[PDB]
Amino acid sequence: NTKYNKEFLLYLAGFVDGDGSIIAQIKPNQSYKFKHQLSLTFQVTQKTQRRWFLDKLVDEIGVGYVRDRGSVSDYILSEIKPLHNFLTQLQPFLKLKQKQANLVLKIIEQLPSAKESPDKFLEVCTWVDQIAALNDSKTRKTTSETVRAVLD
Amino acid sequence: NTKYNKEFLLYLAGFVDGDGSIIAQIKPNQSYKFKHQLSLTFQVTQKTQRRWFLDKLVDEIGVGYVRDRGSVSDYILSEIKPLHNFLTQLQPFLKLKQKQANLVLKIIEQLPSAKESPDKFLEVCTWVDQIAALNDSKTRKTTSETVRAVLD
DNA sequence: GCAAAACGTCGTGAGACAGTTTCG
DNA sequence: CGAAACTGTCTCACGACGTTTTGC
Ligand SMILES: [Ca+2]
Ligand SMILES: [Ca+2]
Description:
- Chains A, B: Homodimer.
- Chains A, B: This is DNA endonuclease I-CreI.
- Two copies of one chain form a homodimer.
- By secondary structure, chain A is of the alpha+beta class.
- Chain A is about 45% helix and about 20% strand.
- Chain A has five helices and four strands; from the N terminus they run αββαββααα.
- A four-stranded antiparallel sheet of chain A has the order 1-2-4-3.
- In chain A, a hairpin with a 7-residue loop joins β1 and β2.
- The interface of A and B includes residues 14 and 18 of A.
- The structure holds calcium ion (2 copies).
- The site of one calcium ion (CA) has 2 residues of chain A, from α1.
- The structure holds a DNA duplex (24 and 24 nucleotides).
């Protein structure tokens, strides 16, 4: 449980509400008990020419990594234990993304107990349904409705 | 001289490096001693549905206004005296737009002294030439080189 | 003459995903 | 079977300007 500075979290909080993104997805995968994977990721996008800023995040936050995708670069943090630790300390300073942040935290908490019941998985599959609305979604496909392919 | 909260500044700073934009322009206007106006402006843009955040900024920052422009809305601060006071307080916490913040501040200071010498005005038109380089410009027209219409 | 407000839009820099592969 | 990586992309939501008008 690595603890972060308050001035660090305050700034970042504003930058996250700015260019950050708190994604939560249900990815269809046959290798999973319920045919879908619950992906949770914290993104931070920026012009590759400004990648150094992204790289600096991997150092300051501790975990995570930075991917390159042409003209733009993202800083990705998908590791659940660390991510839950980050959003726990960050959540109190967010103003725009503070709802999804706490939703993602909620999902992480119920992830183990959602691997058991098909009814719970579907309910957690609903939390993410909420995050997507709160975000500015436009290219979403796999929703909790489709996850009801459980009826077999 | 209104003093802003340190935590308000810490958060806003990240958000400014996020969705904000510190601009400086040279607008061709015949009504001016040198045919050009030195326009300075602090912008903050968000989806019109998230405008409420911009209206909140008008309260917290004390000055400024919010304009509508379709799907998007901007919070604009163009007043010199209050702007200078705001950036002077914000500058230390910025991380991506600190250079331009200060350049703008440099400009404001030498604004009344550039209204006099066509040489001073051409030098300041240069500070702004620097801010644009620092920003992600791609629609710029009137630069200091063009300001050299002073050759009459 | 000039500070500041109006008003319009080019071209992305981003948000928010998707789909597939790897690893243990 | 799952956590987490790797790879790809639609559609903006933004940045950063430009032109014109106030009115004192
Ligand atoms: Ca944004
Ligand atoms: Ca940005």
